[PDB]
Structure 1
Amino acid sequence: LIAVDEKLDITTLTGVPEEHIKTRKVRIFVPARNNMQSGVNNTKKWKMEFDTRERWENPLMG
Protein backbone atom coordinates (compact mmCIF):
# COMPACT_ATOMS: atom_id res chain seq x y z
CA LEU A 1 0.00 0.00 0.00
CA ILE A 2 2.13 2.86 -1.33
CA ALA A 3 1.30 6.51 -0.64
CA VAL A 4 0.86 9.20 -3.29
CA ASP A 5 -0.81 12.61 -3.51
CA GLU A 6 -1.31 12.91 -7.27
CA LYS A 7 -4.55 14.09 -8.86
CA LEU A 8 -5.39 10.85 -10.73
CA ASP A 9 -4.37 11.89 -14.24
CA ILE A 10 -5.20 9.26 -16.87
CA THR A 11 -4.70 11.58 -19.85
CA THR A 12 -1.73 9.58 -21.15
CA LEU A 13 -3.75 6.36 -20.77
CA THR A 14 -7.10 7.31 -22.33
CA GLY A 15 -5.54 7.48 -25.79
CA VAL A 16 -7.43 10.62 -26.86
CA PRO A 17 -5.40 12.98 -29.10
CA GLU A 18 -3.86 15.97 -27.35
CA GLU A 19 -5.96 18.29 -29.54
CA HIS A 20 -9.24 16.83 -28.24
CA ILE A 21 -7.77 16.68 -24.73
CA LYS A 22 -6.61 20.30 -24.43
CA THR A 23 -8.95 22.21 -26.77
CA ARG A 24 -12.31 20.93 -25.47
CA LYS A 25 -14.63 22.73 -23.04
CA VAL A 26 -17.36 20.45 -21.72
CA ARG A 27 -20.57 21.56 -20.01
CA ILE A 28 -21.64 19.92 -16.75
CA PHE A 29 -25.34 20.63 -16.36
CA VAL A 30 -28.73 19.19 -15.50
CA PRO A 31 -30.76 19.20 -18.74
CA ALA A 32 -33.62 21.68 -18.74
CA ARG A 33 -37.20 20.43 -18.72
CA ASN A 34 -38.76 20.33 -22.18
CA ASN A 35 -41.47 23.00 -22.22
CA MET A 36 -43.63 21.01 -24.64
CA GLN A 37 -44.18 18.41 -21.88
CA SER A 38 -45.00 18.58 -18.18
CA GLY A 39 -42.88 15.59 -17.13
CA VAL A 40 -39.80 16.11 -14.98
CA ASN A 41 -38.18 12.67 -15.17
CA ASN A 42 -35.41 13.85 -17.54
CA THR A 43 -34.15 16.54 -15.13
CA LYS A 44 -32.74 14.24 -12.43
CA LYS A 45 -29.23 13.29 -13.60
CA TRP A 46 -26.27 15.48 -14.47
CA LYS A 47 -25.09 15.46 -18.09
CA MET A 48 -21.60 16.03 -19.48
CA GLU A 49 -21.43 17.05 -23.14
CA PHE A 50 -18.77 18.66 -25.32
CA ASP A 51 -18.78 21.89 -27.31
CA THR A 52 -20.38 22.01 -30.74
CA ARG A 53 -18.00 21.99 -33.71
CA GLU A 54 -18.42 22.63 -37.43
CA ARG A 55 -20.99 20.67 -39.45
CA TRP A 56 -21.07 21.28 -43.20
CA GLU A 57 -23.12 19.78 -46.04
CA ASN A 58 -22.00 16.82 -48.11
CA PRO A 59 -21.47 17.82 -51.77
CA LEU A 60 -23.35 14.64 -52.73
CA MET A 61 -26.86 14.10 -51.30
CA GLY A 62 -26.46 17.16 -49.07
Structure 2
Amino acid sequence: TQLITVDEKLDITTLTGVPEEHIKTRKARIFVPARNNMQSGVNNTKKWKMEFDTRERWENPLMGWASTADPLSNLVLTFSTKEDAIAFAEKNGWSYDVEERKVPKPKSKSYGANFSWNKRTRVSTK
Protein backbone atom coordinates (compact mmCIF):
# COMPACT_ATOMS: atom_id res chain seq x y z
CA THR A 1 0.00 0.00 0.00
CA GLN A 2 2.67 2.45 1.32
CA LEU A 3 0.18 5.35 1.31
CA ILE A 4 -2.04 6.23 4.26
CA THR A 5 -5.31 8.15 4.15
CA VAL A 6 -5.35 11.17 6.46
CA ASP A 7 -8.73 12.87 6.14
CA GLU A 8 -7.87 15.56 8.69
CA LYS A 9 -7.25 19.27 8.21
CA LEU A 10 -3.62 20.12 7.50
CA ASP A 11 -2.21 21.75 10.63
CA ILE A 12 1.51 22.19 11.27
CA THR A 13 1.25 24.68 14.15
CA THR A 14 2.79 22.26 16.66
CA LEU A 15 5.81 21.82 14.38
CA THR A 16 6.68 25.41 13.41
CA GLY A 17 8.00 26.44 16.83
CA VAL A 18 5.98 29.66 16.76
CA PRO A 19 4.79 30.53 20.29
CA GLU A 20 1.07 30.58 20.98
CA GLU A 21 0.92 34.39 21.37
CA HIS A 22 2.01 34.72 17.73
CA ILE A 23 -0.41 32.14 16.34
CA LYS A 24 -3.79 32.87 17.90
CA THR A 25 -3.60 36.65 18.45
CA ARG A 26 -2.29 37.55 14.99
CA LYS A 27 -4.35 38.65 11.99
CA ALA A 28 -2.73 37.87 8.66
CA ARG A 29 -3.64 40.16 5.79
CA ILE A 30 -3.65 38.56 2.34
CA PHE A 31 -3.65 41.15 -0.40
CA VAL A 32 -2.22 42.29 -3.67
CA PRO A 33 -0.29 45.47 -2.77
CA ALA A 34 -1.57 48.72 -4.22
CA ARG A 35 0.36 50.49 -6.94
CA ASN A 36 2.45 53.32 -5.51
CA ASN A 37 0.67 56.38 -6.96
CA MET A 38 3.98 58.24 -7.19
CA GLN A 39 4.65 55.92 -10.16
CA SER A 40 2.91 54.39 -13.15
CA GLY A 41 4.66 51.03 -13.11
CA VAL A 42 2.62 47.99 -12.12
CA ASN A 43 5.22 45.26 -11.57
CA ASN A 44 4.73 45.40 -7.79
CA THR A 45 1.04 44.53 -8.25
CA LYS A 46 1.61 41.09 -9.75
CA LYS A 47 1.82 38.88 -6.66
CA TRP A 48 -0.12 38.18 -3.50
CA LYS A 49 1.46 39.21 -0.22
CA MET A 50 0.86 38.09 3.33
CA GLU A 51 1.63 40.49 6.16
CA PHE A 52 0.53 40.85 9.77
CA ASP A 53 -1.09 43.48 11.93
CA THR A 54 1.44 46.06 13.06
CA ARG A 55 2.25 45.89 16.76
CA GLU A 56 3.78 48.48 19.06
CA ARG A 57 6.89 50.41 18.10
CA TRP A 58 8.26 52.64 20.82
CA GLU A 59 11.15 55.00 21.33
CA ASN A 60 14.48 53.66 22.56
CA PRO A 61 15.36 55.69 25.69
CA LEU A 62 19.02 55.85 24.72
CA MET A 63 19.02 56.69 21.01
CA GLY A 64 15.44 57.30 19.97
CA TRP A 65 15.49 54.23 17.74
CA ALA A 66 12.34 52.26 16.97
CA SER A 67 12.26 49.45 19.49
CA THR A 68 9.85 46.62 18.77
CA ALA A 69 8.78 43.42 20.47
CA ASP A 70 6.92 41.92 17.50
CA PRO A 71 8.92 39.15 15.80
CA LEU A 72 6.50 39.05 12.86
CA SER A 73 6.77 42.78 12.13
CA ASN A 74 8.89 42.27 8.99
CA LEU A 75 7.45 38.93 7.83
CA VAL A 76 6.13 39.55 4.32
CA LEU A 77 5.38 36.47 2.24
CA THR A 78 4.89 36.18 -1.52
CA PHE A 79 2.33 33.93 -3.21
CA SER A 80 1.49 33.29 -6.84
CA THR A 81 -2.27 33.00 -6.26
CA LYS A 82 -4.80 33.83 -3.56
CA GLU A 83 -5.44 30.17 -2.76
CA ASP A 84 -1.78 29.46 -2.03
CA ALA A 85 -1.79 32.28 0.53
CA ILE A 86 -5.06 31.06 2.05
CA ALA A 87 -3.72 27.49 2.25
CA PHE A 88 -0.45 28.65 3.82
CA ALA A 89 -2.29 30.69 6.45
CA GLU A 90 -4.72 27.85 7.21
CA LYS A 91 -1.85 25.37 7.48
CA ASN A 92 -0.14 27.62 10.04
CA GLY A 93 -3.20 28.40 12.14
CA TRP A 94 -3.21 32.11 11.35
CA SER A 95 -6.52 33.92 11.38
CA TYR A 96 -6.56 35.76 8.08
CA ASP A 97 -8.54 38.21 6.02
CA VAL A 98 -8.32 38.47 2.24
CA GLU A 99 -8.71 41.59 0.14
CA GLU A 100 -9.59 40.81 -3.46
CA ARG A 101 -7.41 42.02 -6.32
CA LYS A 102 -8.38 45.47 -7.58
CA VAL A 103 -7.65 45.71 -11.29
CA PRO A 104 -7.97 49.01 -13.17
CA LYS A 105 -11.04 48.83 -15.37
CA PRO A 106 -10.47 49.20 -19.14
CA LYS A 107 -10.68 52.86 -20.09
CA SER A 108 -11.90 54.23 -23.40
CA LYS A 109 -9.14 56.36 -24.93
CA SER A 110 -9.22 58.44 -28.09
CA TYR A 111 -6.78 61.14 -29.09
CA GLY A 112 -9.37 62.61 -31.46
CA ALA A 113 -11.79 63.07 -28.56
CA ASN A 114 -9.53 65.94 -27.46
CA PHE A 115 -10.89 67.92 -30.44
CA SER A 116 -14.60 67.17 -30.62
CA TRP A 117 -16.95 69.37 -32.62
CA ASN A 118 -19.63 69.56 -29.95
CA LYS A 119 -18.63 67.64 -26.82
CA ARG A 120 -17.26 69.00 -23.54
CA THR A 121 -14.17 66.77 -23.88
CA ARG A 122 -12.24 69.35 -25.92
CA VAL A 123 -8.91 70.27 -24.43
CA SER A 124 -8.55 74.00 -23.89
CA THR A 125 -4.81 73.62 -24.45
CA LYS A 126 -2.46 70.85 -25.47
TM over 0.5: yes
RMSD (Å), alpha carbons: 0.5
Distance 1:40 1:30 in 2: 11
Q: How big is the shift at 1:15?
A: 0.4
Query: Which of the two has higher C-alpha Rg?
Result: 2
Distance 2:34 2:21 in 1: 30
Q: Equivalent pairs: percent with the same residue?
A: 97
Q: How big is the shift at 1:35?
A: 0.2
Distance 2:9 2:47 in 1: 25
3-state SS of 1:37 partner: coil
Distance 1:43 1:21 in 2: 28
Structure 2 segments unaligned to the other structure (5+ residues): 64-126
Distance 2:62 2:45 in 1: 39
Partner of 1:32: 34
Task: Give the alignment's TM-score, normalised by structure 1.
Answer: 0.96
- 1:5 paired residue among 1, 4, 7: 7
Distance 2:23 2:15 in 1: 12
Instruction: List 4+ stretches of structure 1 deviating above 4 A.
Output: none
Distance 1:59 1:12 in 2: 37
Structure 1 segments unaligned to the other structure (5+ residues): none
Q: Which structure shows the higher strand fraction?
A: 2
